[PDB]
Scaffold this active site. Structure first.
Site, PDB file in Angstrom:
ATOM      1  N   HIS A  44      23.589 -14.364 -36.710  1.00 57.19           N
ATOM      2  CA  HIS A  44      23.280 -14.586 -38.115  1.00 57.19           C
ATOM      3  C   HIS A  44      24.354 -14.013 -39.034  1.00 57.19           C
ATOM      4  N   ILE A 168      17.399   5.070 -36.871  1.00 49.57           N
ATOM      5  CA  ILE A 168      16.428   4.128 -37.415  1.00 49.57           C
ATOM      6  C   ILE A 168      15.789   3.280 -36.308  1.00 49.57           C
ATOM      7  N   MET A 170      13.663   0.038 -35.567  1.00 47.96           N
ATOM      8  CA  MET A 170      13.301  -1.189 -36.236  1.00 47.96           C
ATOM      9  C   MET A 170      13.053  -2.360 -35.315  1.00 47.96           C
ATOM     10  N   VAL A 171      12.072  -3.153 -35.695  1.00 49.79           N
ATOM     11  CA  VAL A 171      11.738  -4.331 -34.949  1.00 49.79           C
ATOM     12  C   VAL A 171      12.140  -5.512 -35.818  1.00 49.79           C
ATOM     13  N   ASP A 172      12.907  -6.432 -35.236  1.00 43.14           N
ATOM     14  CA  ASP A 172      13.339  -7.644 -35.923  1.00 43.14           C
ATOM     15  C   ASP A 172      13.157  -8.740 -34.901  1.00 43.14           C
ATOM     16  N   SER A 174      11.715 -12.845 -33.704  1.00 45.28           N
ATOM     17  CA  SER A 174      11.298 -14.200 -34.032  1.00 45.28           C
ATOM     18  C   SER A 174       9.900 -14.351 -33.419  1.00 45.28           C
ATOM     19  N   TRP A 224      -0.251 -17.853 -27.439  1.00 41.43           N
ATOM     20  CA  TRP A 224      -1.118 -18.076 -28.580  1.00 41.43           C
ATOM     21  C   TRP A 224      -1.027 -16.948 -29.604  1.00 41.43           C
ATOM     22  N   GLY A 304      15.652  -1.535 -32.156  1.00 42.58           N
ATOM     23  CA  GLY A 304      16.613  -1.334 -33.225  1.00 42.58           C
ATOM     24  C   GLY A 304      17.682  -0.285 -32.977  1.00 42.58           C
ATOM     25  N   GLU A 306      19.892  -0.115 -30.866  1.00 41.59           N
ATOM     26  CA  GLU A 306      21.192  -0.648 -30.506  1.00 41.59           C
ATOM     27  C   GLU A 306      22.048  -0.918 -31.735  1.00 41.59           C
TER      28      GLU A 306
HETATM   29  N1  LIG Z   1      14.365 -18.381 -39.560  1.00 41.59           N
HETATM   30  C1  LIG Z   1      14.848 -17.147 -39.469  1.00 41.59           C
HETATM   31  O1  LIG Z   1      15.114 -16.505 -40.471  1.00 41.59           O
HETATM   32  C2  LIG Z   1      15.069 -16.538 -38.068  1.00 41.59           C
HETATM   33  C3  LIG Z   1      14.454 -17.148 -36.943  1.00 41.59           C
HETATM   34  C4  LIG Z   1      14.587 -16.674 -35.617  1.00 41.59           C
HETATM   35  C5  LIG Z   1      15.365 -15.533 -35.365  1.00 41.59           C
HETATM   36  N2  LIG Z   1      15.999 -14.894 -36.481  1.00 41.59           N
HETATM   37  C6  LIG Z   1      16.818 -13.671 -36.264  1.00 41.59           C
HETATM   38  O2  LIG Z   1      17.543 -13.686 -35.016  1.00 41.59           O
HETATM   39  C7  LIG Z   1      17.648 -12.347 -34.504  1.00 41.59           C
HETATM   40  C8  LIG Z   1      17.149 -12.217 -33.069  1.00 41.59           C
HETATM   41  O3  LIG Z   1      15.720 -12.380 -32.985  1.00 41.59           O
HETATM   42  P1  LIG Z   1      15.066 -12.290 -31.531  1.00 41.59           P
HETATM   43  O4  LIG Z   1      13.615 -12.469 -31.718  1.00 41.59           O
HETATM   44  O5  LIG Z   1      15.757 -13.244 -30.622  1.00 41.59           O
HETATM   45  O6  LIG Z   1      15.377 -10.803 -31.099  1.00 41.59           O
HETATM   46  P2  LIG Z   1      15.357 -10.039 -29.707  1.00 41.59           P
HETATM   47  O7  LIG Z   1      14.350 -10.596 -28.805  1.00 41.59           O
HETATM   48  O8  LIG Z   1      16.718  -9.949 -29.182  1.00 41.59           O
HETATM   49  O9  LIG Z   1      14.823  -8.627 -30.227  1.00 41.59           O
HETATM   50  C9  LIG Z   1      13.572  -8.498 -30.941  1.00 41.59           C
HETATM   51  C10 LIG Z   1      13.349  -7.009 -30.968  1.00 41.59           C
HETATM   52  O10 LIG Z   1      13.128  -6.493 -29.669  1.00 41.59           O
HETATM   53  C11 LIG Z   1      14.036  -5.407 -29.433  1.00 41.59           C
HETATM   54  N3  LIG Z   1      14.498  -5.460 -28.024  1.00 41.59           N
HETATM   55  C12 LIG Z   1      15.223  -6.436 -27.407  1.00 41.59           C
HETATM   56  N4  LIG Z   1      15.446  -6.142 -26.114  1.00 41.59           N
HETATM   57  C13 LIG Z   1      14.830  -4.962 -25.972  1.00 41.59           C
HETATM   58  C14 LIG Z   1      14.756  -4.205 -24.778  1.00 41.59           C
HETATM   59  N5  LIG Z   1      15.314  -4.619 -23.630  1.00 41.59           N
HETATM   60  N6  LIG Z   1      14.068  -3.028 -24.886  1.00 41.59           N
HETATM   61  C15 LIG Z   1      13.476  -2.555 -26.015  1.00 41.59           C
HETATM   62  N7  LIG Z   1      13.558  -3.296 -27.141  1.00 41.59           N
HETATM   63  C16 LIG Z   1      14.226  -4.496 -27.141  1.00 41.59           C
HETATM   64  C17 LIG Z   1      15.150  -5.476 -30.443  1.00 41.59           C
HETATM   65  O11 LIG Z   1      15.689  -4.191 -30.825  1.00 41.59           O
HETATM   66  C18 LIG Z   1      14.481  -6.189 -31.604  1.00 41.59           C
HETATM   67  O12 LIG Z   1      14.028  -5.281 -32.624  1.00 41.59           O
HETATM   68  C19 LIG Z   1      16.916 -11.470 -35.490  1.00 41.59           C
HETATM   69  O13 LIG Z   1      17.876 -10.879 -36.347  1.00 41.59           O
HETATM   70  C20 LIG Z   1      15.975 -12.438 -36.202  1.00 41.59           C
HETATM   71  O14 LIG Z   1      15.541 -11.964 -37.497  1.00 41.59           O
HETATM   72  C21 LIG Z   1      15.851 -15.393 -37.814  1.00 41.59           C
HETATM   73  N1  LIG Z   2      -7.554   0.262 -29.472  1.00 42.14           N
HETATM   74  C1  LIG Z   2      -8.472  -0.649 -29.798  1.00 42.14           C
HETATM   75  O1  LIG Z   2      -9.361  -0.388 -30.594  1.00 42.14           O
HETATM   76  C2  LIG Z   2      -8.384  -2.050 -29.159  1.00 42.14           C
HETATM   77  C3  LIG Z   2      -7.472  -2.271 -28.088  1.00 42.14           C
HETATM   78  C4  LIG Z   2      -7.305  -3.515 -27.432  1.00 42.14           C
HETATM   79  C5  LIG Z   2      -8.071  -4.618 -27.845  1.00 42.14           C
HETATM   80  N2  LIG Z   2      -9.000  -4.423 -28.926  1.00 42.14           N
HETATM   81  C6  LIG Z   2      -9.822  -5.562 -29.399  1.00 42.14           C
HETATM   82  O2  LIG Z   2     -10.163  -6.466 -28.327  1.00 42.14           O
HETATM   83  C7  LIG Z   2     -10.229  -7.805 -28.827  1.00 42.14           C
HETATM   84  C8  LIG Z   2      -9.356  -8.778 -28.043  1.00 42.14           C
HETATM   85  O3  LIG Z   2      -7.948  -8.571 -28.265  1.00 42.14           O
HETATM   86  P1  LIG Z   2      -6.960  -9.555 -27.458  1.00 42.14           P
HETATM   87  O4  LIG Z   2      -5.588  -9.240 -27.914  1.00 42.14           O
HETATM   88  O5  LIG Z   2      -7.217  -9.432 -25.990  1.00 42.14           O
HETATM   89  O6  LIG Z   2      -7.414 -10.990 -28.008  1.00 42.14           O
HETATM   90  P2  LIG Z   2      -7.158 -12.497 -27.544  1.00 42.14           P
HETATM   91  O7  LIG Z   2      -5.920 -12.616 -26.773  1.00 42.14           O
HETATM   92  O8  LIG Z   2      -8.367 -13.020 -26.890  1.00 42.14           O
HETATM   93  O9  LIG Z   2      -6.921 -13.173 -29.002  1.00 42.14           O
HETATM   94  C9  LIG Z   2      -5.858 -12.736 -29.899  1.00 42.14           C
HETATM   95  C10 LIG Z   2      -5.809 -13.814 -30.974  1.00 42.14           C
HETATM   96  O10 LIG Z   2      -5.394 -15.057 -30.440  1.00 42.14           O
HETATM   97  C11 LIG Z   2      -6.340 -16.074 -30.813  1.00 42.14           C
HETATM   98  N3  LIG Z   2      -6.474 -17.040 -29.683  1.00 42.14           N
HETATM   99  C12 LIG Z   2      -7.030 -16.855 -28.446  1.00 42.14           C
HETATM  100  N4  LIG Z   2      -6.946 -17.983 -27.702  1.00 42.14           N
HETATM  101  C13 LIG Z   2      -6.324 -18.842 -28.523  1.00 42.14           C
HETATM  102  C14 LIG Z   2      -5.988 -20.186 -28.234  1.00 42.14           C
HETATM  103  N5  LIG Z   2      -6.253 -20.759 -27.048  1.00 42.14           N
HETATM  104  N6  LIG Z   2      -5.360 -20.850 -29.250  1.00 42.14           N
HETATM  105  C15 LIG Z   2      -5.062 -20.338 -30.468  1.00 42.14           C
HETATM  106  N7  LIG Z   2      -5.387 -19.064 -30.720  1.00 42.14           N
HETATM  107  C16 LIG Z   2      -6.028 -18.301 -29.776  1.00 42.14           C
HETATM  108  C17 LIG Z   2      -7.625 -15.404 -31.224  1.00 42.14           C
HETATM  109  O11 LIG Z   2      -8.397 -16.134 -32.201  1.00 42.14           O
HETATM  110  C18 LIG Z   2      -7.120 -14.070 -31.751  1.00 42.14           C
HETATM  111  O12 LIG Z   2      -6.961 -14.063 -33.195  1.00 42.14           O
HETATM  112  C19 LIG Z   2      -9.886  -7.712 -30.298  1.00 42.14           C
HETATM  113  O13 LIG Z   2     -11.105  -7.711 -31.038  1.00 42.14           O
HETATM  114  C20 LIG Z   2      -9.103  -6.402 -30.402  1.00 42.14           C
HETATM  115  O14 LIG Z   2      -9.093  -5.847 -31.735  1.00 42.14           O
HETATM  116  C21 LIG Z   2      -9.151  -3.156 -29.570  1.00 42.14           C
END
Ligand SMILES: NC(=O)c1ccc[n+]([C@@H]2O[C@H](COP(=O)([O-])OP(=O)(O)OC[C@H]3O[C@@H](n4cnc5c(N)ncnc54)[C@H](O)[C@@H]3O)[C@@H](O)[C@H]2O)c1
Ligand SMILES: NC(=O)c1ccc[n+]([C@@H]2O[C@H](COP(=O)([O-])OP(=O)(O)OC[C@H]3O[C@@H](n4cnc5c(N)ncnc54)[C@H](O)[C@@H]3O)[C@@H](O)[C@H]2O)c1
Lengths: 334, 334
Positions: A44, A168, A170-172, A174, A224, A304, A306
């Site tokens: 980017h 810092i 940070m999570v960035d 997509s 999902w 972040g 890195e």
């Molecule tokens: N439409 C848009 O504006 C748009 C759309 C898609 C992506 N982007 C940009 O492209 C860039 C890349 O996005 P991405 O989702 O492919 O990122 P990525 O999967 O490479 O990383 C997402 C996050 O995970 C962390 N991460 C990655 N590998 C890790 C590892 N091995 N262990 C622990 N943490 C780890 C990174 O530090 C980062 O914060 C970003 O700058 C994003 O904002 C912009």
């Molecule tokens: N520490 C805590 O208090 C704690 C920890 C873990 C989970 N929980 C709770 O357990 C529950 C389940 O969490 P989860 O992450 O396993 O949920 P999940 O994976 O079943 O669902 C996450 C989300 O995805 C959506 N989803 C599921 N199937 C989908 C589909 N086929 N298509 C489109 N959207 C779909 C749901 O509507 C929901 O908003 C939540 O109520 C959560 O808050 C609480």
């Protein structure tokens, strides 16, 4: 192609200037493009400059345009980018959210009719650099299909969350597991994705980049869950900025412009002491980095972190850009 | 077995009162435990009651204790739950956020020393019913290893995001692709997970529940994406509330109590017209549901839209509760 910070900015500058961009704005914009690159975000940064230019010529962007505040409810503020430059206007809006957060404890700026902000992490980073928690995101054109569909109807709507830790944290990310850019990288390299990052024509998960690049059935992060997060982030950005949603920008516009973005800044120091903040944050970070590794040779990393090491490396071994990319930039001249 | 709403709520109130819970709070708590169960959330509704009561008797929870505000910067406030009831306090705190957003546009309440809030989605949902955008999350004990590790050092820290749409659109998701509760569901039925949900003893991805429930190497949603998110969500809740982090709660506490939670409410109506809000939001949902399907007979589901039918179905055919669970609750009164 090894280059220098000044060289990159130089190119970016003249290219913009020759395109009806006032030196001031051109310089500012060119600056960010060079900064993003030096930080390690070439995708980017320098790599996106070419596509950024064509959109400018297409009129999607208006270099002479500037943000305008529409409404103020206190801690929240709705603005209108008015098709202004993406990175420049976003940087200002986050700065605004910081100002609002400075007098309200927390601030939020909803931006409509905005352009692609390039690197989202830039805005979260500038906030974390000032001691504030930074959170921002934006919507985009339909480039990914919702969970259960084979047609693209949702955007990658990247979410950014930066924490003023040291370094810092940070999570960035997509909402799509992989970005189409990473797919090309792997395709050209001849390697497959480390994990499923899409669906083939038969509707089966795949790690084959090319297949995904063709059918556009890129896989949402968490399946999902990523799909769902993308939609809710689109609604919030659309609602708070009373702007265009993914659907609107895709079906009503000629390209990706006029999108909606959210910027959030949160006060920290006035809620927790400096020594405590450092101790609490340090315990969290070490609790993560000291965990038994899955691969002893591979150390556990924090999100972040890195961007701190990468930067330091380029400021020493110099910056290196992709030949094919650099060559393209030179072409934009004359 | 089938049970009426009031018959279910009576079983809760009876046990609560027999455990020293105040008459008023008892009825309040029982109410939530019932409503949550009638909404179709049994895992965190009636099935979690026994566990709840156990932590209550162990002293983890103090029914008497009430939320004490600490600091106020304007649109953001830091409160102390003081080990009070998890769901009842979380409800009041989100109401305080909604109260702040009503006059500042956006409100945030950081809460420390809290208890498990049962169903996180309850609070995001309550905000959306009032027409506000609901966002909240909590941390927990380390029950998941950060990306790159094999030792649990991060929490599930669920992120809830609810939109005041019709129906209400909400994502209630943990940072683990699957919850341990769901792993048991599959294992018990000799069923494999629909997608990878953890690592085996050799460090390979697997869809086999059993092995995962054993080594605790549960897979983070989106791999490094979810792992990173869990970490930043924990940092924010810890900082803004100046409370305990995942690490602190896991090592400094005898059980899962004294956690940190974030409650956020954002007003919408003062930034967009009612009709424009219904139209734009409908254009988004329609853009999703009208997507070409991967399976012609499988509708595209929007996040959280299943809670409208679950409720309707339960409010017509009565509530279906597990018999052994019902007997276990009744046995507490013995
Ligand atoms: N439409 C848009 O504006 C748009 C759309 C898609 C992506 N982007 C940009 O492209 C860039 C890349 O996005 P991405 O989702 O492919 O990122 P990525 O999967 O490479 O990383 C997402 C996050 O995970 C962390 N991460 C990655 N590998 C890790 C590892 N091995 N262990 C622990 N943490 C780890 C990174 O530090 C980062 O914060 C970003 O700058 C994003 O904002 C912009
Ligand atoms: N520490 C805590 O208090 C704690 C920890 C873990 C989970 N929980 C709770 O357990 C529950 C389940 O969490 P989860 O992450 O396993 O949920 P999940 O994976 O079943 O669902 C996450 C989300 O995805 C959506 N989803 C599921 N199937 C989908 C589909 N086929 N298509 C489109 N959207 C779909 C749901 O509507 C929901 O908003 C939540 O109520 C959560 O808050 C609480």
């Amino acid at each position: 192609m090894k280059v220098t910070f000044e060289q990159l900015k130089a190119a970016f500058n003249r290219v913009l200037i020759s395109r009806g961009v006032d030196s001031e704005t051109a310089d500012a914009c060119a600056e960010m493009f060079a900064r993003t690159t030096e930080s390690g975000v070439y995708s980017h940064g320098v790599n996106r400059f070419p596509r950024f230019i064509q959109q400018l010529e297409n009129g999607d962007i208006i270099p002479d345009a500037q943000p305008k505040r529409i409404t103020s409810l206190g801690a929240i503020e709705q603005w209108d980018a008015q098709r202004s430059i993406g990175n420049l206007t976003a940087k200002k809006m986050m700065d605004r959210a910081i100002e609002l957060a400075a007098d309200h404890g927390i601030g939020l700026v909803a931006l409509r009719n905005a352009n692609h902000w390039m690197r989202g992490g830039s805005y979260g980073w500038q906030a974390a650099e000032k001691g504030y928690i930074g959170i921002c995101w934006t919507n985009s054109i339909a480039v990914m299909p919702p969970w259960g569909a084979k047609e693209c109807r949702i955007g990658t709507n990247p979410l950014i969350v930066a924490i003023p830790s040291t370094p810092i944290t940070m999570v960035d990310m997509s909402m799509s597991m992989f970005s189409y850019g990473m797919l090309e990288v792997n395709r050209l390299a001849g390697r497959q994705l480390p994990v499923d990052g899409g669906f083939d024509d038969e509707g089966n998960l795949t790690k084959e980049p090319g297949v995904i690049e063709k059918n556009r059935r890129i896989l949402p992060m968490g399946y999902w869950k990523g799909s769902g997060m993308s939609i809710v982030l689109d609604m919030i950005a659309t609602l708070l900025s009373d702007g265009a949603s993914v659907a609107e920008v895709t079906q009503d516009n000629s390209d990706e412009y006029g999108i909606s973005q959210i910027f959030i800044a949160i006060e920290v120091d006035k809620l927790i002491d400096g020594p405590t903040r450092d101790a609490k944050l340090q315990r969290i970070m070490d609790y993560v980095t000291s965990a038994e590794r899955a691969d002893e040779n591979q150390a556990i990393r924090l999100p972040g972190h890195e961007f701190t090491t990468l930067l330091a490396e380029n400021r020493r071994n110099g910056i290196t850009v992709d030949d094919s990319v650099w060559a393209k930039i030179q072409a934009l001249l004359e």
